[PDB]
Structures are given as structure tokens and as C-alpha cells.
Chains A and B, each alone.
Chain A
Amino acid sequence: VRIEDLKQMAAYLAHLAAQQAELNSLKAAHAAEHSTMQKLHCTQVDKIVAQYDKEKSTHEKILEKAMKKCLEIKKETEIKIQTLTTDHKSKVKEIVAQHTKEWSEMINTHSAEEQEIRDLHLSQQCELLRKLLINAHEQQTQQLKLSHDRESKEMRAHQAKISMENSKAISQDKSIKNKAERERRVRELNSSNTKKFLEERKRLAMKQSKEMDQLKKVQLEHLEFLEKQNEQAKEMQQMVKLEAEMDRRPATVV
């Protein structure tokens, strides 16, 4: 609930927004490199097919007309067709095979780039969230340092009040009626108050560190919760690298 207040801060939300624009630029660059290659993949094949069709039609017309007008031309021309299609079937078999290569190398490279940016964004989010939290922890700690200094200030001035207070009412005590005991009572009062103030001073110092130790306790396990949050995010991003390796296979855009 602390992390959520941290995760809706002005600086954090902007980094999220700048990360999402990065993500769009990558999709747009990936798509341009997609279309650049399909055009050339098709451009190449539609050349090779247009030419093969041209050669077959030329040979097909050659026997068709001569048959109307045979002998060896029938035998020779059909050898040229078997020669020519058998070669075409193996020009494309080679091309179609290398067009799978070009695509699959790209899609996996593209898929890798996208994985790495998603990982880099995750290291950038943990580092920001944490640095913000440490900065909050620093202005939390030394604000408390502040109270501790004023807490001592009030005590010293409070202790001065009692001591001066316990010296007027001792003068006004009528029951004394003697200087020798009065000299002693003042010595007795001064020593008792001096002891009391030093003990309350010692108890404040002890109390003050105790409460700062509690600040350390709260701060530590906020940072521990953020570190577990980043660990869980890394662990699941590994399971998409894992599922991606199984899904990987060759592919041919058509």
C-alpha cells in the first residue's frame, strides 16, 4: 500500500509513459522491416514465375502450331519442357527454402529485441521505485532527527522550570526557621533534582534510539517488499523466455 503510493508518483508515471512510447516505436520499426522484406520476397518469386511461364508458353505454341502442320519436334520439344519444369521445381525449392531462412532469422531477432526491451524496462522500474523510496526514507529519518533535537530542547527548558520552581517554594517554607537545616535542604534538593534530570535524560536517549530502531525496522521491510516484487517479475519474465523457446519453429510468409 506504500508501494502503490510510490507507484503513482509524478516521476514514475512519466517513465511508464516514456516506456510505452519506446514500445510503439519498436512495433513501428519491426513492421517496416516486415513490409520491406515481403515485397522483395514476392518480387523475386513473381519474376521467376513470370519468366518460366513465358518459356513454357513459347515451347507450347511451338509444338501446337507444328502439329497442325510432329516427327522429332514432338519428341524434342517435350524433352525441353521436362528439362525446364524439372529445373523450375528446383529453383523455387531453393528459393522457398531460403525465404524461410530470411523470415525466421528476422522474426526471432525481432522477438529477441522485444524480450530485451521488456527486461530493460523492468530493471528501469525497480531502480526508479527503489531510489524514490530511499529518498523518502532519507527525508523520513532526518525529520525524526529533527524531533529528537527539539525533544531534548523541551526537556532542558522543562527541567529548568522545575528546578527554578522548586527553589522559590523552598524559600517560602516557614517551617524551616533555621539556616543550618536550610543550607542542607538546598544541597539536598539540588542533588536530588540533578540525579533525576540525568536519569530522565538517560531514559530519553534510550527511548529515542528505540524509536529510531523502529524506523529502521519499517524501512527495511519496505525495501524487502520491493525486492521481492522485482524478484517475482523477473521470475515470470523468465517463464515467457521459456515458453518462447518451445514455440520457436520455421515459418514462411506467403
Chain B
Amino acid sequence: ATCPIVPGQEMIIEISKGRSGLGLSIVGGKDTPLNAIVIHEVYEEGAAARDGRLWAGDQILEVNGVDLRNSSHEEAITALRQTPQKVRLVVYRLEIFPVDLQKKAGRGLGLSIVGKRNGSGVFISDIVKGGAADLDGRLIQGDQILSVNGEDMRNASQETVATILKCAQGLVQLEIGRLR
């Protein structure tokens, strides 16, 4: 037990996972264009939520002295699972750009829509492999759908954005917010 969380420096903190789950949610990796492992929401049931110091935008750089600079997204989640009951971490403290997509024959956009467990917004969950969104390749898991064809979805429901995206017919102009 040495220090509290302060921005600007490569901090080194330790969390006690104990019997509860760590409860982090990750975005990015070497497989993605983001090229960083970034915390996206802290699940309230988890241990880091108990700990209190990790906020929802913190960049993870190593777990148990395992450098994540080359770790893919899947590699980074297992790195979270392989932690003992104690946890060793090193952390640091949106990008907005447009993506237009054309709906494929039968499926549609080929992406999943969900909301944060605690917090407003609506984000991309899963990208169907042969999907229309996959072959475009610019979207990744955790990307926020800011608007759809101009209309701002920032404080919209999951039913709202689901309904708009499903019923849209031709080319779908999306704004996307991503962490940094």
C-alpha cells in the first residue's frame, strides 16, 4: 500500500481481487487500430470498484509485469484472468470520426448494440464476422455511437438506437466516439 491515483505519471498500484471479480471492461489491443488497452467501464460489483481508484478512462500498461504493448485484445483479457487473489497493475491517466456503412443482403449492419451497465450512452458490443461493419473494419468493440444520420444519440436508450439502426434503409452515416 503506497500511493493514491494521480494523472500524468506511469503509476503502479495493487488491487486485492479477493473472492470477488476484478470487474474491468477493456477496449483496444495490437489487433485493433487503437493500439492501447483502455478501461472502458468499471463494473460496480467488482474489486476495482471496491478499491475506488480506477476511473473509466484509465490506460493499463502491464499486469504482473507483463507488457501489453504487443498484446491483442483477447490476450489482454486473459492477462486480467491470470491474476492471483492479489493484483499488480501499472496505469496511466474522445476521438470522434465518421463511418458510413451500406447494409448487406439479409443481415443488416452486422454489429451489436448495448448500453453501459451504469452510465448513459450506447456502444458497439460484438462485430459479426462476415458483417457489413466487419469488412469496413474501422469499428471495434466499445465504440460509442454518437449520432446516426445526424441525430445525436449521446443520451439515448438502447431501444432508441436499436430501433433507428434496424429500421434505417440505405447508407447509414455514423459518428463514432472512441477512447484515447
Instruction: Give the residue name and chain of the A residue nearest to B111 (CB).
Output: A254
> Are B108 and A252 in contact, CB atoms less than 8 angstroms apart?
no
Q: Which residue of B lies closest to A97 (CB)?
A: B159
Are B108 and A253 closer than 8 Å at their CB atoms? Answer: yes
**How far, in whole Å, are A246 and B20 apart by their CA atoms in the complex?**
11
Q: How many chain B residues have a CB neighbour from A under 8 Å?
A: 35
A246 and B163 contacting across the interface, CB-CB below 8 Å:
no
**A97 vs B162: C-alpha distance in the bound complex, in angstroms?**
9
- Which residues of B sit under 8 angstroms from A252, Cβ to Cβ? 112-114, 158, 162, 166
Contact B162 A96 (CB under 8 A): yes
Contact A251 B114 (CB under 8 A): yes
Q: Say whether B106 contacts A243, CB under 8 Å.
A: no
Number of A-B contacts (CB under 8 A): 90
Cross-chain contact A240 with B81 (CB below 8 angstroms): yes
Interface residues on A, range: 20 to 34
Contact A247-B166, Cβ < 8 Å, known A239-B81, A240-B81, A252-B158: no
CB pair A246–B159 under 8 Å, yes or no, is no
Q: Does A71 interact with chain B (Cβ within 8 Å)?
A: no
- Write out the residue numbers on chain A whose beta carbons fall within 8 Å of the beta carbon of B129: 31
A-side contacts of B159, CB under 8 Å: 93, 96-97
- Return chain A residues, CB-CB under 8 Å to B111: 253-254
Chain B contact residues, CB within 8 Å of chain A: 20-23, 25, 43, 45-46, 80-82, 106-115, 117, 125-126, 128-130, 158-159, 162-163, 165-167, 169
